[PDB]
Design a protein around this ligand. Structure first.
Ligand code: SF4
Ligand code: F3S
Ligand SMILES: [Cl-]
Ligand SMILES: [Cl-]
Ligand SMILES: [Cl-]
Ligand SMILES: [Mg+2]
Ligand code: NA
Lengths: 598, 269
């Protein structure tokens, strides 16, 4: 037992293992200890995969790197390619043309929406929504709930919900429950009424059909989704208005705009209202657990500058907050060797000196799969992992030694802080948060006949509910932003600038013989960075620090815990043998384990 | 009664799972609700941990030799297999156990089919394709990074309709989807035939949609349905959007030189 970051870790209680953690990308094991009252007093995050992309990249051509690292992850598809081309461009002093900037921004924001919406409905919703309870729902009351939750959403009739419900019933009555098989249905951790459950499952099915339309934006600009193509120096999708012979003409741009408009409708009418409603009801039930590090330490690099290459115009302005002091945002510099560092003290890697963290330009990735002496089981049959030693394929990133939470919630807390200090570029996220708090505290309770609450954003945001809300709000904001990017793109093209690629330094003979660069991205799950060293036209070093690397990290040299482990602390479980609460909170980070380990 | 599918994940990026849910004809919704019984799948399944583990045994018993094992990703042989851990044990043990009683095995994507990115040199985990580990079962390879959505659901549709594996080429790929090279029906082929090429990105030739051979396009050596079926309900494909094919459905495509290095001996194509 020991204390760290205000958390009292104790491993003397009952040990519970969750392996595999499902409804995530990739492979994770989670262990917790619970006390005599089923409250979590210890949490252990274990990344259970590694591929070694950083090793594979050595000696290759920097221009090819984006395609390799894109295959770090097919869920957050393209965000690694973006980081890579940015990193190489930074190393080689390449400035991309305006159209390439705007197209990359549109692609990035499309990924944000697709990733966030699919995560919530298809990975997260089943932690809040009891599908069996949806079978008992009354169609008319479901219709009336739908009309209160989102008046503008056209799919609100009683017969529509009846038909969806009946197909569910037929599915369940077959005896082949598929993904609902052996679920935790009926647990008291589920609090939604039948009608809310039917509404949510209906939207699960709606989102499943619609999500494939949104990614056609990627397909136009990048050829395919998953894994659209990128390019060092710009974008491959050359523009010609006068014309069916080029990748991009006005018809293709009109198609993109139509998809963007549909996205805006979905976020506004389906996704944001559902999260506000579900958040309200779980708030009413008192389920405000899962804050973890969000109550103290949050980080993002900052993203989406209005003016390209001008960081002061970031529309999700970043930095670092410490100790829950929202009146002081520290600037974060990815080039500073004393800021972003990764430890491997409790990870399956080795350094020359493991008492220190390495900045990623000096990063090292040598595998070292070894288990501690207090392990229960064997090297190939683990029963209880030994967290006092090395226990994960995820490295431990820290900022000036501090453990930080990253992600949409972090970006929204930072945006709120920036807006309060006079930053005008953060106006829209501030507006969203205040709107959301009013809906959750007052408007939705009034509509459903529930008592009003008076939670501040300070109290509400650092929670699993808050983390889920911020993701939805971010999806909405991204859809809005790329609507504006589209207009700017078409305006620039019509003004006569059709350029999509700067090829001045395409040939390696033009490069400096040694160079280093960094590319950062506000990826769906938080702060993403790629750090590259180039030597004689080849990759000397390539190190990735990925958002789930931050959040999912094991303990550092000082024994400080990461965001996942902190978020599970102090949480009661209804049943220790049903990981409902563990899944709900872990899923609120949208873990991507392939990303975390790469 | 719908055919049970147990969809396992080894070392992977999950692109094949994402591609699958992009299918428009048929909809993934309709596949899951009305065609198969997707009984194990880490991406979507409600159960976790011990409850998830318990499903495998239950389906294998009830549907012995009548379920499909779909594998996304691949097993690592280094680190004692513990560079991919499931239930505290190496993934390769899960793969072999579930393969035992499968009616058929689908190797989704380049990872399961050939190795893909983790198997690129120097392959630090010794990631190994499914067919080199499971040697006593019929395996259909559906390569690509990821495969086209409609190719994935097309394979499922064929298998469910006929209860047979579709006709395969020498490399174990379905001829109905992998009989054509990209270069055969690529819409830029008339430019190739006329010697009309892009030489630098965004040159006048690129703006007229000239052939991408000299920018490294591997269409002439790559078998897939991208030039006809195309991507995301036939919206585009890599070449239409201006990037050469990188050869992503072909065995060992990461180690055939830079993606921007042209194929030699153009007179062969
Ligand atoms: S080389 Fe590539 S772009 Fe040119 S015709 Fe062949 S497949 Fe199409
Ligand atoms: S890169 Fe792959 S997606 Fe098709 S065009 Fe080439 S086989
Ligand atoms: Cl960029
Ligand atoms: Cl391969
Ligand atoms: Cl080749
Ligand atoms: Mg790394
Ligand atoms: Na152009």
């Amino acid at each position: 037992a020991y204390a760290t970051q205000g958390f009292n870790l104790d491993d003397r209680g009952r040990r519970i293992v969750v392996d595999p953690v499902t409804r995530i990308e990739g492979h994770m094991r989670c262990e917790v200890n619970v006390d005599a009252n089923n409250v979590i007093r210890n949490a252990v995050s274990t990344g259970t995969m590694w591929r070694g992309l950083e090793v594979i990249l050595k000696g290759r051509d920097p221009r090819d790197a984006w395609a390799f690292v894109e295959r770090i992850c097919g869920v957050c598809t393209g965000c690694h390619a973006l980081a890579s081309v940015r990193a190489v461009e930074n190393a080689l002093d390449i400035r991309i043309p305006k159209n390439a900037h705007l197209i990359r921004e549109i692609m990035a924001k499309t990924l944000q929406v697709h990733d966030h919406a699919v995560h919530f409905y298809h990975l997260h919703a089943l932690d809040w929504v009891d599908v069996m309870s949806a079978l008992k729902a009354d169609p008319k009351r479901t219709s009336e709930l739908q009309q209160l939750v989102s008046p503008a959403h056209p799919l609100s009739s009683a017969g529509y919900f009846r038909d969806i419900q009946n197909r569910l019933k037929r599915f369940v009555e077959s005896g082949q429950l598929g993904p609902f098989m052996n679920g935790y249905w009926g647990s008291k951790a589920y609090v939604l009424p039948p009608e809310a459950n039917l509404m949510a499952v209906t939207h699960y099915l709606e989102a499943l059909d619609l999500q494939k339309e949104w990614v056609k934006i990627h397909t136009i600009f990048g050829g395919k989704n998953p894994h659209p193509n990128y390019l060092v120096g710009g974008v491959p999708c050359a523009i010609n208005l006068d014309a069916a012979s080029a990748p991009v003409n006005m018809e293709r741009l009109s198609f993109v705009k139509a998809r963007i408009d549909e996205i805006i409708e979905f976020n506004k009418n389906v996704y944001v209202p559902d999260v506000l409603a579900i958040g309200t009801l779980y708030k009413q039930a008192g389920w405000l657990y899962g804050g973890g590090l969000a109550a103290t330490n949050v980080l993002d690099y900052g993203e989406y500058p209005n003016v390209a290459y001008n960081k002061s115009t970031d529309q999700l302005p970043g930095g670092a907050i410490l100790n829950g002091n929202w009146d002081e945002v520290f600037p974060v510099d990815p080039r500073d060797s004393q800021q972003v560092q990764e430890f491997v003290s409790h990870s399956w890697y080795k350094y020359a000196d493991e008492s220190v963290g390495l900045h990623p330009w000096d990063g090292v990735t040598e595998p070292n799969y070894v288990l501690g002496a207090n392990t229960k089981g064997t090297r190939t049959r683990i029963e209880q992992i030994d967290e006092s030693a090395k226990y994960s394929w995820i490295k431990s990133p820290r900022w000036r030694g501090h453990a930080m939470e990253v992600g949409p919630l972090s970006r929204y807390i930072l945006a709120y802080a920036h807006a309060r200090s006079g930053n005008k570029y953060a106006e829209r996220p501030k507006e969203q948060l205040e709107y959301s708090a009013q809906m959750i505290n007052s408007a939705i309770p009034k509509a459903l006949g529930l008592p009003e609450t008076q939670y501040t954003l300070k109290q509400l945001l650092p929670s699993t509910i808050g983390r889920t809300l911020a993701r939805a709000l971010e999806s909405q904001y991204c859809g809005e932003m790329m609507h504006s990017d589209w207009h700017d793109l078409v305006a620039n093209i019509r003004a006569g600038d059709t350029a999509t690629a700067n090829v001045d330094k395409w040939d390696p003979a033009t490069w400096p013989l040694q160079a280093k660069g960094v590319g950062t991205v506000a990826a769906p799950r938080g702060a993403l960075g790629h750090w590259i060293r180039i030597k004689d036209g080849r990759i000397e070093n390539y190190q990735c620090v990925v958002p789930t690397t931050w959040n999912g990290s094991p303990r550092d040299y000082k024994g400080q815990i990461g965001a996942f482990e902190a978020s599970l602390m102090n949480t009661p479980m209804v049943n220790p043998e049903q990981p409902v609460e563990i899944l709900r909170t872990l899923h609120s980070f949208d873990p991507c384990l392939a990303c975390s380990t790469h | 009664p719908r055919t049970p599918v147990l969809w396992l994940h080894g070392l992977e990026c999950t692109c094949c799972s994402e591609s699958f849910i992009r299918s428009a004809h048929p909809l993934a919704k309709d596949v899951v609700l009305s065609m198969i019984s997707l009984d194990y799948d880490d991406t979507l399944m409600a159960a976790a941990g011990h409850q998830a583990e318990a499903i495998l045994e239950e389906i294998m018993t009830k549907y012995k030799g009548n379920y499909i094992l779909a594998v996304e990703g691949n097993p690592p042989l280094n680190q004692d297999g513990m560079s991919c851990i499931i239930g505290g044990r190496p993934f390769i043990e899960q793969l072999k156990y579930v393969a035992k009683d499968a009616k058929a095995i689908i190797s989704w994507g380049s990872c399961a089919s050939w190795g893909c990115v983790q198997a690129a040199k120097p392959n630090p985990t010794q990631a190994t394709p499914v067919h080199k580990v499971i040697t006593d079962k019929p395996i259909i390879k559906v390569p690509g990074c990821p495969p086209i959505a409609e190719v994935m659901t097309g394979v499922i549709t064929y298998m469910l309709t006929f209860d047979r594996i579709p006709e395969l080429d020498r490399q174990g790929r379905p001829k109905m989807f992998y009989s054509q090279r990209i270069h055969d029906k690529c819409y830029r082929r008339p430019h190739f035939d006329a010697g009309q090429f892009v030489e630098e990105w965004d040159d006048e030739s690129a703006r007229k949609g000239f052939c991408l051979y000299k920018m490294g396009c591997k269409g002439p050596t790559t078998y897939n349905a991208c030039s006809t079926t195309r991507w995301n309900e036939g919206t585009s494909f890599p070449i239409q959007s201006g990037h050469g094919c990188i050869g992503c459905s072909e065995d060992g495509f990461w180690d055939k030189g830079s993606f921007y290095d042209r194929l030699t001996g153009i007179s062969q194509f």
